[PDB]
Amino acid sequence: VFAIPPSFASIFLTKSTKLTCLVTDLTTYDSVTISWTRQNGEAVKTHTNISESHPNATFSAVGEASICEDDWNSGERFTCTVTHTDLPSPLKQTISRPKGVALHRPDVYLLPPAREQLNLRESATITCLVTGFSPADVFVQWMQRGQPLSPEKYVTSAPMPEPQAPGRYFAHSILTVSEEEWNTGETYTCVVAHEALPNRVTERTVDKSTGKPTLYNVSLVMSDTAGTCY
Amino acid sequence: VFAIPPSFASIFLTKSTKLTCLVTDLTTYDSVTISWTRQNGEAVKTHTNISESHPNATFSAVGEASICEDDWNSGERFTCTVTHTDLPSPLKQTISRPKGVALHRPDVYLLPPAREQLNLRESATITCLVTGFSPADVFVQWMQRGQPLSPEKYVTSAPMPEPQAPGRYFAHSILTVSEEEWNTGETYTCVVAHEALPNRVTERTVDKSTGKPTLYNVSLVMSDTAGTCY
Amino acid sequence: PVPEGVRLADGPGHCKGRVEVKHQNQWYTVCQTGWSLRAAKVVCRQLGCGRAVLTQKRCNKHAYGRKPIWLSQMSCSGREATLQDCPSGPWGKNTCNHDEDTWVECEDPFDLRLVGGDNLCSGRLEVLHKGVWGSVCDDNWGEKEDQVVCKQLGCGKSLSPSFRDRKCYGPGVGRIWLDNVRCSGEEQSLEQCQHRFWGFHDCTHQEDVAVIC
Amino acid sequence: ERIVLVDNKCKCARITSRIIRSSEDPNEDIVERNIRIIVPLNNRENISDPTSPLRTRFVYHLSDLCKKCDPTEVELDNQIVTATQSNICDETCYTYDRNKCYTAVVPLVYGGETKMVETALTPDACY
Numbered sequence: 001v002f003a004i005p006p007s008f009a010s011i012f013l014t015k016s017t018k019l020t021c022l023v024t025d026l027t028t029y030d031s032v033t034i035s036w037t038r039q040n041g042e043a044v045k046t047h048t049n050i051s052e053s054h055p056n057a058t059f060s061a062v063g064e065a066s067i068c069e070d071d072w073n074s075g076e077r078f079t080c081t082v083t084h085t086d087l088p089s090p091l092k093q094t095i096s097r098p099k100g101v102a103l104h105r106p107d108v109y110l111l112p113p114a115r116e117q118l119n120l121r122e123s124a125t126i127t128c129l130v131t132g133f134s135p136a137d138v139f140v141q142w143m144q145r146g147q148p149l150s151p152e153k154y155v156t157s158a159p160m161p162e163p164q165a166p167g168r169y170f171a172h173s174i175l176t177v178s179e180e181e182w183n184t185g186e187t188y189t190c191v192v193a194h195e196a197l198p199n200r201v202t203e204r205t206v207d208k209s210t211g212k213p214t215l216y217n218v219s220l221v222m223s224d225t226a227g228t229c230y
Numbered sequence: 231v232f233a234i235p236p237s238f239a240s241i242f243l244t245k246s247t248k249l250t251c252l253v254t255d256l257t258t259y260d261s262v263t264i265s266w267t268r269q270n271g272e273a274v275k276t277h278t279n280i281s282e283s284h285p286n287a288t289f290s291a292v293g294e295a296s297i298c299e300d301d302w303n304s305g306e307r308f309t310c311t312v313t314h315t316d317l318p319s320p321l322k323q324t325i326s327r328p329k330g331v332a333l334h335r336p337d338v339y340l341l342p343p344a345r346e347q348l349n350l351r352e353s354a355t356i357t358c359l360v361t362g363f364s365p366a367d368v369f370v371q372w373m374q375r376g377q378p379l380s381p382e383k384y385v386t387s388a389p390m391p392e393p394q395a396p397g398r399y400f401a402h403s404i405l406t407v408s409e410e411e412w413n414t415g416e417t418y419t420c421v422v423a424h425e426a427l428p429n430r431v432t433e434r435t436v437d438k439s440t441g442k443p444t445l446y447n448v449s450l451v452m453s454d455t456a457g458t459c460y
Numbered sequence: 461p462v463p464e465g466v467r468l469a470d471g472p473g474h475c476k477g478r479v480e481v482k483h484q485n486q487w488y489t490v491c492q493t494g495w496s497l498r499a500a501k502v503v504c505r506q507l508g509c510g511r512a513v514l515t516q517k518r519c520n521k522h523a524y525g526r527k528p529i530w531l532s533q534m535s536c537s538g539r540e541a542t543l544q545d546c547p548s549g550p551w552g553k554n555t556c557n558h559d560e561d562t563w564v565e566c567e568d569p570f571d572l573r574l575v576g577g578d579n580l581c582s583g584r585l586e587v588l589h590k591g592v593w594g595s596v597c598d599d600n601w602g603e604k605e606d607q608v609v610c611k612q613l614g615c616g617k618s619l620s621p622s623f624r625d626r627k628c629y630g631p632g633v634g635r636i637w638l639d640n641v642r643c644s645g646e647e648q649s650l651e652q653c654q655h656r657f658w659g660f661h662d663c664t665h666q667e668d669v670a671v672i673c
Numbered sequence: 674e675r676i677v678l679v680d681n682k683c684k685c686a687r688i689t690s691r692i693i694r695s696s697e698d699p700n701e702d703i704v705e706r707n708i709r710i711i712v713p714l715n716n717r718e719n720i721s722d723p724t725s726p727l728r729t730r731f732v733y734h735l736s737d738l739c740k741k742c743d744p745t746e747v748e749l750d751n752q753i754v755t756a757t758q759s760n761i762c763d764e765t766c767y768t769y770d771r772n773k774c775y776t777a778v779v780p781l782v783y784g785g786e787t788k789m790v791e792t793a794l795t796p797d798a799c800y
């Protein structure tokens with residue numbers, strides 16, 4: 001049984017570390033005795049809403065143990081105990097938070113849309129550049145004015161290895177908006193959820209005017225007395 | 231199993247159409263069949279052009295067949311039969327060119343590194359925002375002063391669909407340069423190759439001097455006797 | 461491993477074709493693992509046929525007939541002149557694939573003809589970038605351009621005329637290959653001068669320049 | 674160190690950019706943009722038609738000045754290809770250009786011949 005571990009994006013959207021022992025590589029059979037047991041020697045209330053039978057060389061019973069954040073990062077080797085006809089033994093896979101990963105915080109940079117994008121006047125793409133973070137578990141969500149946008153409006157790439165740094169990763173997430181919305185001036189906050197951040201959330205913001213003043217020094221020279229030479 | 235097609239990166243940079251499927255070392259086999267068979271049935275001969283060098287490394291090889299005709303560009307049901315006596319089910323993979331995909335030209339935007347990033351004085355990440363291309367495959371290479379930069383300097387993402395667009399894709403290319411190069415004003419050019427481009431390659435260049443200015447000084451010399459420019 | 465000459469045959473042109481190689485009267489052809497554009501920049505330098513444009517490792521239908529695969533391996537920098545200036549160490553090493561041949565589409569070299577005049581040393585300027593002859597434009601024309609083009613013509617030195625004979629020697633017709641050509645005075649020929657792109661002109665045919673020397 | 678960003682001699686706009694090495698820290702060096710625009714007070718709306726009315730409104734789309742629609746060459750590993758430098762294009766000419774000579778044709782009559790002779794709207798341009 002291939003038990004998918006709860007990723008940080010999965011435990012951040014739900015605020016509940018629901019680790020799943022989805023019954024993979026075992027076909028549909030009888031003798032269901034699926035139980036999630038903690039490594040101390042006990043078990044909790046487990047598997048609310050398991051799905052029906054799907055004999056496409058697998059099953060669909062899902063682990064739904066609502067253990068906590070202080071439970072998952074405690075390092076307790078949680079084991080699911082799926083038994084079936086093919087193997088009459090609990091398939092106790094070892095799932096826990098690995099301690100070998102380094103913990104370097106993201107350096108989140110929020111590049112504004114290019115001036116050509118607003119010049120084309122159909123779309124503006126604000127790109128969040130989450131770079132320099134060591135565990136490849138980042139959840140990026142965008143808020144317009146403090147409330148989240150829909151996940152269809154932004155797309156976040158998978159964490160890919162930063163090439164110059166040894167084991168740090170990087171990830172870029174764009175949000176394609178209309179040019180008229182960006183010209184009004186909105187906050188467009190990029191919230192980055194990661195374990196190594198001091199408060200587990202950083203937030204960056206770009207408005208229409210997010211840089212320096214760019215002070216103008218215009219000179220209407222309205223005579224030929226001060227007119228230029230060549 | 232994998233059968234990587236020639237994309238527009240392999241078509242344009244190398245000018246050689248190489249059909250390639252990777253046979254990972256599931257089990258050691260003497261006569262490894264990476265026979266690249268056409269829908270017609272004739273097999274352009276390939277054998278162990280480069281070893282896979284996987285962590286197991288048990289008789290694993292890469293077979294690249296140079297079917298370089300117009301039959302790939304027109305399209306055919308090319309199949310390499312990864313048939314092996316060890317694990318006797320043949321783990322073959324079939325790949326064809328995707329047919330009738332509409333062609334929209336990429337709108338390439340070069341984003342300079344953030345003002346937040348240059349304050350760290352450690353590294354500068356230049357973003358090539360290739361977006362709006364509806365054929366999926368795209369080739370992005372960075373050049374500095376007309377010389378091709380090393381592929382370890384930049385990392386380009388897989389194309390993912392643009393959110394608001396129906397089937398148009400977007401891609402990133404993050405070039406990680408040191409800050410002392412970007413603050414001295416070095417031109418980093420983004421060369422991007424796509425099928426829908428008119429000249430097939432677009433070159434965006436960025437550097438500090440073009441950038442976004444922080445002090446426009448304009449002089450509208452309104453001279454009576456201008457006439458011709460000098 | 462002595463590459464005396466590398467002829468270009470089976471192609472529409474004298475120096476657009478597939479790469480052969482000659483050693484000791486044996487006409488042979490070259491495969492290469494790393495066969496970049498810089499190799500073609502060498503190949504269409506020892507033949508003196510322009511700059512290198514395209515380098516295809518393009519196969520064809522197998523009934524072409526071909527010479528065997530050249531024994532050594534040729535990988536070098538590309539800034540050098542001939543196929544002897546760079547090493548060809550691994551002799552007898554044939555690691556190309558089964559039946560493929562290379563291809564070079566380097567340009568026809570820059571032939572420059574002073575046309576429209578009574579002698580070949582005095583006329584309107586016409587150049588050969590592609591297969592089509594064409595004039596050049598006089599945007600920001602300078603005496604450095606005149607001395608460079610007269611040095612390339614092999615016809616002495618310029619005299620900087622009073623523009624009347626240049627306007628009397630013909631407007632010309634056709635296409636304008638060069639605009640805003642700018643020579644530093646030290647370049648051997650007109651290609652090595654700074655210019656706008658070939659065939660992109662903001663001028664009509666009334667602005668075709670003439671150089672007198 | 675004024676790098677010439679555009680040198681448009683048809684609208685007379687010259688844009689030059691420099692990094693002013695203002696302070697010791699390499700970040701606050703201001704990217705300075707020098708737009709120098711010569712406004713011809715007496716040139717007509719159509720410069721090639723000298724009977725055109727006087728040009729009063731002088732609109733300068735600075736993106737249209739900064740477009741580079743001359744394809745450049747790039748050097749790939751196996752190829753040299755022409756590369757477009759902009760997505761903008763696919764001309765008012767407020768001022769005459771020095772390098773370009775502009776001619777208008779006038780109806781000149783002596784005995785009703787109406788011999789249409791070209792003038793020189795800009796003298797000392799093609800002399």
Ligand SMILES: *[C@@H]1O[C@H](CO)[C@@H](O[C@@H]2O[C@H](CO)[C@@H](O)[C@H](O)[C@H]2NC(C)=O)[C@H](O)[C@H]1NC(C)=O
Nearest residue numbers: 718719720721722723724725764765776777778
């Ligand atoms: C600007 O003026 C020139 C000269 O009068 C115009 O060019 C002529 O235009 C007419 C009508 O379009 C043509 O019949 C002539 O053949 C043109 N002559 C030349 C030498 O080009 C030009 O059209 C005017 N442009 C504008 C925008 O008004």
Ligand SMILES: *[C@@H]1O[C@H](CO)[C@@H](O)[C@H](O)[C@H]1NC(C)=O
Nearest residue numbers: 217218219445446447448449
């Ligand atoms: C713009 O400011 C600079 C100093 O930063 C000054 O030298 C220049 O004269 C100003 N331009 C004007 C007044 O047109």
Ligand SMILES: *[C@@H]1O[C@H](CO)[C@@H](O)[C@H](O)[C@H]1NC(C)=O
Nearest residue numbers: 219447448449707708709710
């Ligand atoms: C901009 O300021 C510089 C001073 O650094 C000055 O020399 C230049 O003339 C100004 N630009 C214009 C267009 O006047």
Ligand SMILES: [Ca+2]
Nearest residue numbers: 599639640662
């Ligand atoms: Ca010109």
Ligand SMILES: [Ca+2]
Nearest residue numbers: 598599772773
């Ligand atoms: Ca001229």
